[PDB]
Amino acid sequence: ADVAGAVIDGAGLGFDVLKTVLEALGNVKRKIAVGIDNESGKTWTAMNTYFRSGTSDIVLPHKVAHGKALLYNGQKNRGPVATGVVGVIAYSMSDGNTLAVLFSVPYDYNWYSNWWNVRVYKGQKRADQRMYEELYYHRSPFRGDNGWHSRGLGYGLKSRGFMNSSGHAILEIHVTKA
Template identity: 35%
Template sequence: MGARQSGIYITNKTHGYTLCNPSLHLVSGLCQIPLPTKLKPSESGNALFSKIGGTACGSVGVFTYDLYDPATDRADKKIAVMFSVPFDYGRYSNWFAVGAFDRETNCDNDLYHKMYYSDERGFIRGKADGHDLKHRDDDVVVTLGMTNSSVATLKVDVHNREQI
């Protein structure tokens, strides 16, 4: 059985927001390197999610970060990223999505299903085909790129809206 991994690389390119309080929901696979607990402006971090050895499953899930504004001492929104690196490429492809949600949004199977299957507003989804996704919110712009391979790389960049 081949490797199925999702390497996540996150860069906070904002001028004032801190990404904090990460949450993770894995539909399949396991966490080998956890998400950074906090990313201040200009900081970067990484995580690694992999399939479980000996199983016919991929590396699939969703994670969120609170978007904390120190000027107001509040986190009114969450940034969410969905990723799917399937086991069976005969039936599935790599998919990814990014969006911004209110702070009460739970990082769970409901959020994963919404971002994988639904056409609701508040996020953008795409097949990993070499094109980046860009989600514009009132405060931030999040760009997300994903390679189309069984050992996929996701690159997440968070910018202030006025930067892009």
Template identity: 30%
Template sequence: MVYLYFTADTPVLVLKQALWRCNHTRETLSSPQDRRKRTQHCCLAQRGHLTLKVKMPETAEAVSATLTTNRNCTIEITNVSGSYCLINPKVYMSSGFCQHPPQPTVRPTKTEVCSFTKDGNTATGAVGLLTYDLFHMQSRVCSDRMAIMFSVPFDHNLYKNRLSVGVVETSRACDKHLYDQLYDGKDLSNFARSETSGGGLEYQATYVDLRATMSSIGKAIVKMELYDKMGR
């Protein structure tokens, strides 16, 4: 069994099967008598659990630097909301594929990073859609779905990077239909869209606000923040 607990500065991975292991001798202490004896004679014995530090999430810039293609998109999501947790991520790719998958859960005050890149040896871009369900922690209900559409085209002479963010019903699937609506749909009631030059983009939903930016280069970075609606 493996589980996590959190200290003030870092999460700690706990291995259940490693209980009562001496950090000095690496000896497994199976009986209560052995545990008492080792604890008395080895100052380095750690009663309870063997703990391992877990590496914290990298920044979007650090993840982007690892991508080897010339057309990719790295998305950094920061959950500033105190009411909502992001769960159940879904991805639809019109072009390219997911390189670093989205985190299953983005808890309040946390920042997570994922990335998408073009197919190798092809004149294509990294274009797709990422959605998360908005889980309201007090009512324990998912009533809305957050959507991020990103487009990093192969030919920047003809096209610009494009970004859309919005909130739709949970009944809306993360698919080509929703992607098409966010990419060039005429009805902007559920999302905001822009061809990016590094400027900001904001969408105000009923209960949350989304704020995002996207760089204009081929190795694009998107930074998005989720806020509780002001005054609620």
């Protein structure tokens, strides 16, 4: 597969797939293509995306087994508004825990930058304003700086991810066993 909303083989996740996802959104000022590869050994089940800013029409891919990746996208709210796309995706995992992913693609790059983060929480925790504040303000998010960043997640897992710095953003994340 190759479109936002699909669950594909994990090895198939890569730039060309995401670039096509990003271009499919068309001419909007702020948008993001997200790909997350599950090599965690756990099965993931979608909970929700909390949009602090912006929106998506993509059904969050529901079941993402080990060895599979999900494709997703988001974009700024329609019309002459000076806002970007900022949100948190939450998946529950078969171990009873939650994988949380932050993305932030701001409107005003004079003041703000691209950011992302990945965290595992114990228990099933839906994405919400509180989780957004935790991931963005308190939990040392990574900059969308055209670099790869890796970090242990606890619970026997680790994350590695890459995000560019512009308003047409690509975020690629791989979750693996630590």
